[PDB]
Amino acid sequence: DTETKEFESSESVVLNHLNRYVFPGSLLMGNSIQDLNYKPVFASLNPITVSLSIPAINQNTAITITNPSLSATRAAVYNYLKTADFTQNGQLSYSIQQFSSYDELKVAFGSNVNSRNLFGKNNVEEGMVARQSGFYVKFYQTSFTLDMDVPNGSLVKDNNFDSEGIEPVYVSSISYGRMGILAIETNEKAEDAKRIINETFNKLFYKKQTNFSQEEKSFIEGADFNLYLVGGDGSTASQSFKGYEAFVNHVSQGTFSKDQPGVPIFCSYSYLKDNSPVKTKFKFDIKRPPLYVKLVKENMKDINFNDPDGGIYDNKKEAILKIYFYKNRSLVPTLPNPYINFKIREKKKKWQSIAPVYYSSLDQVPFNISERILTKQNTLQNIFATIQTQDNTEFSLISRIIRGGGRQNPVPAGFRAIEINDYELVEDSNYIIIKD
């Protein structure tokens, strides 16, 4: 049981192991950019004119690459920056979004990249956020950008090239600098997590401060972090840590220079055919995670109405039945999923006799048995739900035993009436029962 999700991207995050294919005019297979399995198309390329923008200082220029290539692009940029003003920290930006599956981070990367495998995932719970709440933070510093002009005709010189009948594409714009995508898992509630996360990032990443409150410090020390960073310091896979000082080192601004001016962090593509912009429509399915339910008795009351002078002892046991919902076996609370019908079995054991019957055990009583199933639905407002079994009360009778021999032989023995109700969850295809 999955959830299909569709998004469209005109821009892709450049993974650390692929930045060699990302430069202005880089000609690639039209079917190799969606899964980041870049396949260069070998062709003779014409000169290109690209606009170099340093948005942190609000400056722009125009460099020319006669023979498009990564080396010519590196040489062109440096030989401009070595004579011009540049930036140390670039243009900062971050965006905070909640997520439940690491497959949803595909959208943050703007491609059909195996995001869960990239973040160390890959039951379906393996690719699911474990703690109460999950948020990812896409933060980046843009040092400079390269944006091609529309070619005057074709970017290619000769149409004699092997693209395997696939209409090729070429890298038409690139943004350079440093980018991280930080997954955060907190047992805190989402409203509080989102606020604490925004507050701590405006402090460290933006303002470079570290005067966190104890609330924010406790959030950091108790949160699970998993970062994928694109940069000179970037790994090919994510990195899972759990530390404040580790949090402060990683979320901190990076530095740029004329010798290290930033790596390709995201890029856009055009078609070689008509020089039109490229946009991909993606579709991925999120396997719905399981629902765990536990039946519990609460507000339990054991009442004894005893008449030792008349040899009658009435013991009534009661409780409020309650089902609790969880997203995993670690009892992380969750709001129930819509349209699940929670089923509770009531097995009743009833017996009575006008005259005391001296059974040595309740396993000897000839009980009259009856069973029914209660059904609870539409409970999507709380991480638990009360199970009503009677009229005019949230309490359910667990036990009701009256015994005794009467005024004559006023012993606490014999049996006059027994009613015993046993309760359990009924197996369903939409939830897994947890019974202690």
Residue numbers in the entry: 77 to 198, 203 to 516
Authors' account:
A recently found family of pore-forming toxins, called CDC-like proteins (CDCLs), are wide-spread in gut microbes and are a prevalent means of antibacterial antagonism. Analysis of the CDCLs belonging to the phylum Bacteroidota revealed the presence of sets of two-component CDCLs, one long CDCL (CDCLL) with four domains and one short CDCL (CDCLS) lacking the fourth C-terminal domain, that act as a bicomponent complex via a mechanism only previously observed in the mammalian complement MAC. Unlike CDCs, the CDCLs require proteolytic activation with both components containing a proteolytically cleavable activation loop critical to the regulation of pore formation. Here, we present the crystal structure of a proteolytically activated CDCLL and cryo–electron microscopy (cryo-EM) structures of a prepore-like intermediate and the transmembrane pore.
